[PDB]
Amino acid sequence: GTTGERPFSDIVTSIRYWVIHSITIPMLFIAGWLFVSTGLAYDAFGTPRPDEYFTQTRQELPILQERYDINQEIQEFN
Amino acid sequence: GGRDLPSTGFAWWSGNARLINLSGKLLGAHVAHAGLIVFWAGAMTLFEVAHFIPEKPMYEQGLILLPHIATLGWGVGPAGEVTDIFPFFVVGVLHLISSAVLGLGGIYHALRGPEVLEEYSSFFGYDWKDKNQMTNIIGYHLILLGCGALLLVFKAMFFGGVYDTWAPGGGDVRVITNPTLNPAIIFGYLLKAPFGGEGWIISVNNMEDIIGGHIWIGLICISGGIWHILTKPFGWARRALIWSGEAYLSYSLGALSLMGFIASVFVWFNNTAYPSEFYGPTGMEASQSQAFTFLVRDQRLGANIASAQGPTGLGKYLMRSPSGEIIFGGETMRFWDFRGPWLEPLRGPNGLDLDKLRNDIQPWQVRRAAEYMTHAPLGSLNSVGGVITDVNSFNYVSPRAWLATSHFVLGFFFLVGHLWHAGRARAAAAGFEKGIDRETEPTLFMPDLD
Amino acid sequence: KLPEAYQIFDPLVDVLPVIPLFFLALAFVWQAAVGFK
Amino acid sequence: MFAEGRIPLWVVGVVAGIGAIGVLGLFFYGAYAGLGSSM
Amino acid sequence: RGWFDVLDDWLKRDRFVFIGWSGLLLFPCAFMALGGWLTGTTFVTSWYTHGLASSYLEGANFLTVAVSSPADAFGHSLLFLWGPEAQGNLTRWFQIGGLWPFVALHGAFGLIGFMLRQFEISRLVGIRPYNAIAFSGPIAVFVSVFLMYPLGQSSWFFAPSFGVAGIFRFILFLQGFHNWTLNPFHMMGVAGILGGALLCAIHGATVENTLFEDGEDSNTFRAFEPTQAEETYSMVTANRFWSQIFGIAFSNKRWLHFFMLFVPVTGLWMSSVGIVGLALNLRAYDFVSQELRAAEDPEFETFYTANILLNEGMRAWMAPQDQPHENFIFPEEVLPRGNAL
Amino acid sequence: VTYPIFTVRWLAVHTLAVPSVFFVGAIAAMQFIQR
Amino acid sequence: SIVFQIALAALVLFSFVMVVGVPVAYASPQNWDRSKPLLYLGSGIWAILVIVVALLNFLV
Amino acid sequence: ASLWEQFCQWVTSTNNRIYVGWFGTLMIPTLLTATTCFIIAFIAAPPVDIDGIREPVAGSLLYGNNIISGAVVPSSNAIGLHFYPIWEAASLDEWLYNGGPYQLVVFHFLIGIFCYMGRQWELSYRLGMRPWICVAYSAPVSAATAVFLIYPIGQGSFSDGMPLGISGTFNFMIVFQAEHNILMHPFHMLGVAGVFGGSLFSAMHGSLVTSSLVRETTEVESQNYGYKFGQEEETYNIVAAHGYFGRLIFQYASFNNSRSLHFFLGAWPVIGIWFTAMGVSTMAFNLNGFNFNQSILDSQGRVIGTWADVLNRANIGFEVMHERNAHNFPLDLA
Amino acid sequence: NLEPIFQLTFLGLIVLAGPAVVFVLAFRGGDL
């Protein structure tokens, strides 16, 4: 009835699994936390911070209109 | 008692069915649960007191328990203004402490007390099939229900009064002195149609009728309690009903479903037992308030509000009901049965009176109409007030909306529970709740249909 | 607001009403402690 | 705990569910604070 | 033993997660799709394509996040990361909505991989492949809605966005611009989906209420064994019950289950045909006879004409914010509205 | 008995769980961002 | 007014003690002879604390 | 032996081709009444002033409708929640102008379907069956009561009931979205999960059974002839089906118990339709779906739109255009 | 602010109280 792997209930009730995952799951959690809280996610994905939806020279939506040269368009949009 | 499937035949997800024939543990379940109800009453009241801003209207503040206490006449004055915060706190504390007592008693009977009460006492021990004992328990509990209704009567007549929104001089806590004992009025409320303009018992519009109904209910429940202590079920009742614990449960489920629907409609339509000073305006109230607000505003600008036709040809502000009554125009024509203490002074025998609309409108009626039209029971699930196309700046859903939605849903699911337990009670008493017996399958002996 | 001499326990009151919900959770925990038999 | 070298599975489920409801409560708190709260 | 047969042995081993030959298409592509969705709704904005916040990073919730469709200026450009728009710039690729064709194309190939997995496991187990044939319904809906509909339109912009409220927008868009409720192909889809839900409910309840007493517990679930040869419920009693209640009943279990397949799959295929029609604006928008009558006679009103007015209002009030690339300036006086609203 | 630790099922479980917990920590950090 | 806060804090601390203790004592058939007078004394102490809180409320 | 006992035996007879029963004594007259009046009104009823603004809407086939556009139009907004039977009208033509046939059809239909549910219990009792098919049928009943009774009660007018027609149904849905944002209501979201999942599970179950049928025929004849009505043996291999589906996803995602699987099939769309019926029944009291309009603001306080804001623009369009001559005042409060 | 600290502490105490009762009854083998 079992494909051959260790059953999940035997794994998550073992001391070794919790010794390892008591560090690995909080480290992944705080790594995602530091991805957001250091502001790195904003520069990585190009998502505006709450103060860069509009600039001093642009009060309108920065809707892309060029077919190809979108790097220059977004830089201009700032 | 069995606490597993091999010894009961009931799984964990149906565990409380393991108690059907264990009367002591059943009593402890029932009493711990009552603990829970009184616990929510007390703790929710203390929460509502802690979050209450008393100079702000209760209905702005997400309160459904303090309006109930305020309608009884505690902690409020004229126009439902909060005199003292202490009666609400007292009601909360007493429920919370008592709930501790009820919880300790349920745990006892549930975990330590005798699992069956029949070998211990004949008065408390019951068999579900013992029709005399079942009606005895009905009878004790009916005398107590009648005593509760008479306690409401005593609060209204002898211990400070109830809030009357219809009181002259403005709505106030007043002592009821001449309750309607006339059985023609009291039971003609039961005979009235459940439709527009009639409203069955939802249309009770005065505190004298309410308090007189509770004198009669108290009398009826006390008399029915003695009846059922002293008597046994008759032959037609014995041959008509299923006599089992699940059957009696399902009868109570159908009863609870009916009262849940009645409560949702009551709080949605009735402004007497649910005064608009505490619960906010009804939907009909708010629509009539908007029509009145713009009647007053355009009359101040010099519009002839009676001779003004709208775009359709009907009167823009005033028009005729289907029976001819002079009513407000636009879509609120639907709500021309609405009655409220701010509006009834402008009504004549034929409906809305032109003379009173011209030279009898007071500033407080304008203020109340503006407040009620802007506190209409329209709101989003995340409590954004007004119409759903509005933007996020008004944190409001009416207590009438919350109470009505809750009790409608509760009432529906308790009808579902009635069908489930009635059907199962019938199948279990008839012996095929566990499935069709293969040897004596009834269809295999029936003739073919065609 | 609460009466003033009770105002030190305003946070506890703020978590009081959801205790019945935990009761519905608690039975499942107890069934988990016995193996859902 | 009780089991030798074995944490009981119901304890693991209790802790995991408490953490799951905690992060869901944090998300519902964030609906009313900071970004996306309309204030 | 050649390397192909050894690899076929490894891919088709019995393990917790079956891989197969189809998994080589299924498992990366699906992981590209779902992760690409989960990345976008967590982090990626639609500010430069739509003028909208669509990520958890911007403050949107689960109902309002989306992997939104690309900017309309790209047309039907596939928007490769290396393509002539992003030119290998990952950040620019995210900003121009390249995650939408990333998720839609990896999803397409993942759905192909899943159907191939259904075929492969059906062959290895030894059963007929009707699960894959049933799964053609969802593939027809995905291909018509997410691929063929924007391909008939101006750009990928008018494709549905991979989000909850974005899908809701697409739904209301097809109402007000296409009168998609009036389309008989959609009405057949509604009939199929509601009928499949009816069949699911009625079949489950009928089986659970005509069960044979094969055990002693009130728990009836343990009176069944998977290796038993006999039916666990009475077909005869169920047939008599529905014949006397409803008038007709199933007498053939095989036809019952084929019908349970047939109804929602046919509904999905018919609604897909209608969506292919909407791709070219080939709408069931109007009844021209009722329009000519209403144009010549201003007392004639039906519910159809009322719905036409509803669509007119939604188009005029929604278009400037929904199509921000068009720069629709509609002044307040041109917006259709009734009295007092 | 003597089960393998690393399997295809292991890689399957971690391929999803590891960025799941990363993203959940990210969204938890997002809950405290002010306007 | 600080002694009323001490009385109410004592009431909630002993209430937490009783929340932990009462179902454990009721679900312990092998420690019942020890724990039943402890339950009696806890009920009496809790009731006395509630009455003291009421009296000090009307004293403050 | 008595005449009444003979009538009781005929009414409750399992030998009747259509089971009557005591619930049937109510269902048959009511459903026949509502069916007759519906057919006659759908073919030939004159236009109905639904909005109470003397703007009569033509609903019947003879007045220029087709099958799609035809409807039995709801009763007048001037009537509201008032009881309007035939005998309270001064003439039949007045009753027709004010939408009386809607009240007649709806009231009889709703009684008829509640008695249909009771009759389902009743026949299950007379056949020795388990009784809960009627519990499953309570979900379409709850939805029908929500749109024909509960939403008019909450809004204070039968004029707000779903019209008895196809395009009238669409009008009801669109105006409902305009006024309540039902798409953003988590209970409709459960309804949609109910019907989408119910169709999914219908297809999976049907496909798994048809995939695993025991070979009993040739490929000339239809496979359905491999089943005999009343046969004792099972016609498909549940172990093969389980061995397929537990490799399609994984082993413990697959039902090995047919009773557990059939329960799940029954329960999922019934629960979903219960939830969406309560969504419409609670939106009757204007507890509407989620409002996230201007939920996101930039650091200055300028609105950053989301898809909810675009959806709100669509909702505005519907709202400012619906019942376009009915409103005299700035707010649609009911 | 310190209000939300106390709220969470009171909530965490109440949350641990029930599983504490279950855990002491299971650890000592009470009448579970």
Ligand code: CLA
């Ligand atoms: C209102 C809720 C409620 C109530 C009052 C009960 C009550 C009861 N259940 Mg049910 N039950 C419920 C909900 C409820 N149940 C739910 C939701 C489920 C589904 C998970 C079940 C599933 C279920 C099963 C499967 C079984 C019961 C059984 C029982 C009975 C014996 C309990 C037992 O042995 O516990 C022993 C448990 C413990 C000793 C653990 C500790 C429990 C205590 C009460 C904790 C109280 C904490 C509280 C904060 C302390 C306050 C103290 C004081 C300050 C007031 C008891 C009468 C059993 C039965 O039928 O008996 C024959 C049984 O087999 N129940």
Ligand code: CLA
């Ligand atoms: C009759 C029940 C009832 C009603 C009408 C209200 C109404 C209200 N409460 Mg109260 N409350 C209740 C019970 C009730 N509550 C209970 C039982 C608790 C303890 C858990 C609380 C605890 C509580 C707190 C702590 C607070 C409120 C607040 C509020 C207000 C805002 C509610 C809100 O935003 O909800 C949001 C809406 C939801 C969460 C929707 C829930 C949907 C439910 C789960 C659907 C259930 C359907 C069905 C029954 C499930 C069956 C499934 C099965 C049959 C298939 C409002 C006046 C707030 C307020 O303003 O107070 C000042 C507040 O802070 N309440």
Ligand code: CLA
């Ligand atoms: C509906 C509730 C209810 C019912 C029917 C019972 C029934 C019973 N209990 Mg239980 N009990 C309850 C609640 C209930 N109890 C609560 C809440 C507690 C906690 C305080 C207890 C604690 C308890 C213990 C510790 C014991 C019992 C025992 C008994 C049995 C003997 C009763 C007796 O001696 O009466 C005769 C006693 C009297 C007539 C005097 C009491 C009269 C009451 C208490 C005064 C007025 C009632 C109340 C204050 C009015 C307001 C109530 C409010 C909710 C409206 C009997 C089966 C005994 C047992 O198990 O026997 C084996 C036992 O040892 N009970």
Ligand code: CLA
């Ligand atoms: C909630 C409390 C309660 C409960 C559980 C019962 C339960 C019972 N009563 Mg009792 N009764 C009560 C309160 C209660 N009664 C009160 C307060 C009184 C005093 C007025 C009486 C007076 C009383 C008498 C005089 C008799 C009973 C009898 C009975 C038994 C059979 C009842 C029956 O078949 O009804 C089913 C109802 C019918 C068969 C009547 C059909 C009429 C139609 C269906 C009414 C439909 C109305 C509709 C659904 C709702 C409209 C609401 C409103 C407008 C009317 C049963 C044990 C009988 C018995 O056996 O005596 C010992 C009996 O003769 N009761």
Ligand code: CLA
């Ligand atoms: C006071 C009313 C009442 C009472 C005493 C009972 C009593 C009983 N019911 Mg019934 N039931 C009721 C109302 C009632 N029911 C209603 C209203 C319905 C319709 C929904 C049902 C439907 C029903 C079914 C379908 C079945 C029972 C069964 C049973 C028996 C076992 C119950 C059990 O162990 O539950 C165990 C409890 C659980 C497993 C937990 C329930 C989980 C629910 C869905 C939570 C709902 C959410 C809630 C609103 C709070 C939201 C929390 C959220 C924030 C997480 C028992 C005799 C069983 C039976 O027939 O036994 C003979 C059975 O199969 N009941």
Ligand SMILES: CCCCCCCCCCCCCCCCCC(=O)OC[C@H](CO[C@@H]1O[C@H](CO)[C@H](O)[C@H](O)[C@H]1O)OC(=O)CCCCCCCCCCCCCCCCC
């Ligand atoms: C049995 C499992 C239980 C586990 C226990 C876990 C609990 C975790 C819950 C929430 C975590 C954060 C708590 C709230 C932070 C407090 C901040 C505050 O005071 O107010 C923050 C805001 C507004 O903040 C305001 O600020 C003012 C000045 O600072 C004042 O302090 C006001 O009092 C305050 O209201 O109010 C809220 O956001 C409260 C709403 C959200 C509260 C919790 C949401 C739902 C939580 C859990 C429900 C989840 C359900 C999922 C699963 C259900 C099925 C089981």
Ligand SMILES: CC1=C(/C=C/C(C)=C/C=C/C(C)=C/C=C/C=C(C)/C=C/C=C(C)/C=C/C2=C(C)CCCC2(C)C)C(C)(C)CCC1
């Ligand atoms: C049996 C059973 C069960 C159940 C149980 C129950 C149901 C219970 C209960 C219980 C209860 C029902 C309880 C209680 C309590 C209470 C308390 C404990 C209290 C108190 C008090 C206090 C302390 C208060 C204080 C205060 C004051 C005085 C005022 C101010 C504020 C405050 C709050 C501070 C279950 C489900 C688990 C299952 C198993 C079995």
Ligand SMILES: CC1=C(/C=C/C(C)=C/C=C/C(C)=C/C=C/C=C(C)/C=C/C=C(C)/C=C/C2=C(C)CCCC2(C)C)C(C)(C)CCC1
């Ligand atoms: C308080 C009050 C009041 C009063 C009221 C009254 C006076 C009442 C009443 C009441 C009543 C007086 C009631 C009732 C009821 C009844 C019912 C609800 C019933 C029923 C039924 C049944 C249940 C039956 C069933 C059956 C049948 C159908 C046949 C067969 C058998 C059987 C049993 C199944 C008023 C309004 C003035 C005001 C407000 C307050």
Ligand SMILES: CC1=C(/C=C/C(C)=C/C=C/C(C)=C/C=C/C=C(C)/C=C/C=C(C)/C=C/C2=C(C)CCCC2(C)C)C(C)(C)CCC1
């Ligand atoms: C885009 C892209 C990419 C991809 C990536 C990937 C593939 C990844 C991923 C990812 C992922 C894969 C992520 C994740 C996640 C997650 C999450 C975010 C989660 C969650 C959750 C939750 C929150 C849940 C909750 C709940 C509920 C609600 C129900 C019950 C309870 C619980 C708690 C369970 C690459 C780089 C290649 C390239 C470029 C582009």
Ligand SMILES: CCCCCCCCCCCCO[C@@H]1O[C@H](CO)[C@@H](O[C@H]2O[C@H](CO)[C@@H](O)[C@H](O)[C@H]2O)[C@H](O)[C@H]1O
């Ligand atoms: C788990 C989440 C998965 C989603 C993706 C997460 C990755 C994080 C995003 C990092 C973005 C880096 O930011 C951007 O990277 C690209 C690489 O493609 C760089 O791109 C640069 O090199 C590439 C490679 O030849 C050139 O084609 C491109 O023209 C040039 O601009 C940009 O100079 C840099 O601004």
Ligand SMILES: [Ca+2]
């Ligand atoms: Ca606080």
Ligand SMILES: [Cl-]
């Ligand atoms: Cl319209």
Ligand SMILES: [Cl-]
């Ligand atoms: Cl109006």
Ligand SMILES: [Fe+2]
């Ligand atoms: Fe089946």
